[PDB]
């Protein structure tokens, strides 16, 4: 741009940044932990593995 004007961040961009980060973190952790749980859960069908 002709005068090297700034990137034009908003006021409270730090609020927005933290909201996006911590919400995306909390969303991702809840997905990841639930995914890890259902991935590693035990179906316990041993009565068939023996036969």
């Amino acid at each position: 741009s002709p005068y090297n004007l700034a990137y034009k961040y908003n006021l409270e961009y730090s609020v927005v940044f933290n909201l996006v980060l911590w919400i995306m973190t909390g969303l991702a952790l809840a997905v990841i932990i639930t995914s890890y749980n259902i991935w590693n859960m035990d179906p316990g069908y041993d009565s068939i593995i023996y036969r």
């Binding site: 997905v31 639930t34 749980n37 259902i38 859960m41 068939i48």
Partner: peptide
């Protein structure tokens, strides 16, 4: 959607395995 689907998936999965076992 997603968290309800994860819930329903765990529900369906875990209970489904018990149904499979019981049916024999």
């Amino acid at each position: 959607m997603v968290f309800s689907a994860m819930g329903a998936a765990y529900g369906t999965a875990k209970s489904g395995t018990g149904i499979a076992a019981m049916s024999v």
